[PDB]
């Protein structure tokens, strides 16, 4: 199925996923598409930050669901 990942810079990534796929997995697909190491990828969906150990269906991600790639910003 298709999911969408939106970056803070406003770039949209399509991903090809299974409901069973890990978060570790989704992240390496990001690394393939975008180059960002999994280490620096912070994913959020429906109010929750997606943690490595778990899978997609855990967080109730569906087809056409949108994730967001986020960041801490220094300076204020």
Q: Which residues bind other proteins (CB under 8 A)?
A: 6, 8-12, 32-36, 39-40, 42, 44-49, 51, 66, 68, 70-76
Rounded-to-integer distance, Cα 37 and Cα 19, Å: 22
Q: How far is CA 13 from the centre of its chain?
A: 9
Choose between 48 and 57: whose C-beta lies nearer to other proteins.
Answer: 48
Choose between 24 and 44: whose C-beta lies nearer to other proteins.
Answer: 44
Q: In terms of C-beta density within 10 A (0-12 exposed, 13-18 middle, 19 or more buried), how is residue 67 classed?
A: buried
Shortest separation between residue 53's beta carbon and other proteins, angstroms: 11
């Amino acid at each position: 199925m298709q999911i969408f990942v939106k970056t803070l810079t406003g770039k949209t990534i399509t991903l090809e996923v299974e409901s069973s796929d890990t978060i570790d997995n989704v992240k390496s697909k990001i690394q393939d598409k975008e180059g960002i190491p999994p280490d620096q990828q912070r994913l959020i969906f429906a109010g929750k930050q997606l943690e490595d150990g778990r899978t997609l269906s855990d967080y109730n991600i569906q087809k056409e669901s949108t994730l967001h790639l986020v960041l801490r910003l220094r300076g204020g």
